[PDB]
Design a protein around this ligand. Sequence first.
Ligand SMILES: [Cu+2]
Ligand SMILES: [Cu+2]
Ligand SMILES: [Cu+2]
Ligand SMILES: [Cu+2]
Ligand SMILES: [Cu+2]
Ligand SMILES: [Cu+2]
Lengths: 336, 336, 336
Amino acid sequence: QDADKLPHTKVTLVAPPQVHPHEQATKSGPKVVEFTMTIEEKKMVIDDKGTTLQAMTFNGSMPGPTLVVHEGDYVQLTLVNPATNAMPHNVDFHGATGALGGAKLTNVNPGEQATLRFKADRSGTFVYHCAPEGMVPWHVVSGMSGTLMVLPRDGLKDPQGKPLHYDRAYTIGEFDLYIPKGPDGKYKDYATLAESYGDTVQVMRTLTPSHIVFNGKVGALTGANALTAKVGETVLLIHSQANRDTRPHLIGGHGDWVWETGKFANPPQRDLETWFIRGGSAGAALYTFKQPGVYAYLNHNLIEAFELGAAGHIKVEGKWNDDLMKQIKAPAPIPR
Amino acid sequence: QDADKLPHTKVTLVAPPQVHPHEQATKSGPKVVEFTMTIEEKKMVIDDKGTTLQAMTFNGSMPGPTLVVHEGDYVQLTLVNPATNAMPHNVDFHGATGALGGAKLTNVNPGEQATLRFKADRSGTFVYHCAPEGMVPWHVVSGMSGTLMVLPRDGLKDPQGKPLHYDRAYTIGEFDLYIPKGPDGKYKDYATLAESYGDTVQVMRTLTPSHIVFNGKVGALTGANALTAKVGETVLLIHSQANRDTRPHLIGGHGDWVWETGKFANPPQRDLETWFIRGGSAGAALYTFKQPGVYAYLNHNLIEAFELGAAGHIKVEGKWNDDLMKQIKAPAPIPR
Amino acid sequence: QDADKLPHTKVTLVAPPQVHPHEQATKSGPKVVEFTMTIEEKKMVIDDKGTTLQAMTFNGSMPGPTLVVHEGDYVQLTLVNPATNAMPHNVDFHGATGALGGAKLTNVNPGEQATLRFKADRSGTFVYHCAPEGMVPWHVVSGMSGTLMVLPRDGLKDPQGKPLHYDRAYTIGEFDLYIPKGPDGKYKDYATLAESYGDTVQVMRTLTPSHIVFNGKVGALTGANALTAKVGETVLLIHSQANRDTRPHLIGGHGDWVWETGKFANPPQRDLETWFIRGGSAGAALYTFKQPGVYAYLNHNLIEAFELGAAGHIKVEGKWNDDLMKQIKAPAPIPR
Ligand SMILES: [Cu+2]
Ligand SMILES: [Cu+2]
Ligand SMILES: [Cu+2]
Ligand SMILES: [Cu+2]
Ligand SMILES: [Cu+2]
Ligand SMILES: [Cu+2]
């Protein structure tokens, strides 16, 4: 179990909402899993009115990509901060032990890179986020967070120890955004990242987000970009919130098996209508679709979902089952 | 188990805080339970200063009435929207599967009605709420929500599988309200429901309620309208919050057995001082009274309870037990 | 089990963050444990800018001291309100049964004292707080709350019934503060406690704290006042929040065994990154340190932690373990 003598394997990361290919239950022994992530500071358009955010990301997306390893594996991450960026960054893994999650050992200025290795000895979905001394909240609410999933070597289990399996995994990062308004009542547009700082911290301190979005913008997971599934498929929905609480719900469905605190050595809860993700954590739910159609996946503070942006769609193909739900009489005039 | 061949039975709904008569454990097989609810848009007075709310309700109350069925039963609901109302409505049951909880099949304009049937295959307390496309948060925060309780056919159980029984059930709906203030610092009064919309959404977006009430108004469950019980009785307290988190507490008592996520196939937690209801869900607690007197049942964000309104009373008759609590020395001058 | 015939023992209270000496598992039978607490109204400096709070405390600290007894013991408290104070006070124990937690029997005006006895028949960490009729939220957010810990007579256990033991216990009270600003944008300073009332309630009603602190001020548990431990030691972290939700996290560590609702008859959850304390409750976590260094213990709403004050430090001595975490390559220029 000395990591220097284990087999090493490189994994290619994919952009949310997909998750890189991985095995659930595995016969493989422990290994050193190597990943590389590059920081990108960039301006992004977050709604249909043209509102912009001076964003900071891991690998160009919000959230950063999901990393998947098995319990007892070592994670080896190379963190690159290109010279085209303006600020220093680092990474704190909530799945790791010591040195402020790894943040003390990964301080990289623009033009530098560093490599960290840590043992992933606890199963579950964990947040990772950037945390530079003196500017922690700003880097996190500007987009620097993602999930590390550490699967039990034997896969997921129910409370009686029966195996659970998913057909597809999706990863959703929910972001509370603090975009300042000018004297004319319109959102401000900044030429540089540094220029947004002073106005943004003043808004953060009100604790009232201007927008709350899934994966980087209002409507990111709707219409053409909806998540997809089929009746009969079991989906794993991973949900991270690195700063603020949220309460996910699947309209028309349920959480069949849910780990709301996200830690797989604890028994899941079943049949949840709405679950709770604590700010600074990632949770996970399993659901097996039984009806076709469009489902909305949202934060069930409905103002936060419909007014501020935290809602997405899942489009499901299959046959309608009238034994679970049936329209007996369609809307018609009240009988007189 | 084809619903078309099961026995059908009509149930008469009662107004909160009571719950219609029902059996806990039942020897009866599955059935189609028929209910009817009528929407009522009306102006209501929500405090002792004369503040009004342009409200929207199921069956004229906030919350709407609690529906009770057993796991494996079918719910058959007729939803009526009279021609005296101005808006279109529908219903989303979190206990149902498919078609956005039933909302896609129950879109009724003023002057129409529709009938839906769904299988209640998961036990627990669930929220039901209205959710018309494009105006979801407004209909919900204006009062359109209630609870569906699906009891296990064998009744409630503790974590070791021992039977739990309640003598009385009460249902409390907690509502975060967003009442606009005019230029003179007083709450606005609207002539019609439609006229309140524009000002109300602006307040909703601040995420700061003006009032937070139990069952429709400040002081609804106090004084003459307090809930009642006797020492030795076991009470079931159902608590729904369709939009915002809340944290119920019984001053002078406890949650003996609590399902805070409200789903009865999971083991309850015991001896809770304060529990948590996620916005968009209903939970349930059991308590057996051991001391007489007045108890306060409230949201333990104390500003939310005492300043904004989320507090009620339970008045309990019986004999005082000095073995559980005794005043050794009543307040008196410090001895010099 | 008649309390009048049990042995009586007086306990000397210590100031947070320490907890008075006590046994975990005990062979001792039930007893009457006597404690005395004196109220102190005083002005305190809560940050490094000179901001003051007109505070109200149990025994001169925020939070008040932690009381520790074993399940089946009786608590006997003498509450003293000196004639140098201006307001009436009382105490509500969430661990007690009846008379609004004891508040109805402990109403003491300045110059008076009272003595209450109650049976501590439920294990767990409970909040105690002051609750004078008509001014409940103000006394609580001004500092009047603390924790009562009722240990199982057999000590703490894991979900399989295996014994858990801690080497040291620390107690942290988190306070949301509502300090008013004047017309010049600076925080107001009041000559008396009574003069702060009117402005303070107006700020409370916005539900937006100006500051959120651990143990009475920004930086209370940092630098020279950091908590301390050694690699290999198991620490018990008690966290109370009598009014508002919070989500504790140990950067670089985990919650090995956590009772987030704080009630020890329920099984703990393991491997948590971040846990949740409901406003109006106290929870508890155990952690065994495996790496030396500075750890930050904070509310993982990072704005609340770094901007508003809710963060502390734990300084741990010992040897670094490169098998759990290793810097493979220190920050260096990207290779060209
Ligand atoms: Cu950064
Ligand atoms: Cu963190
Ligand atoms: Cu409606
Ligand atoms: Cu809903
Ligand atoms: Cu007081
Ligand atoms: Cu209390």
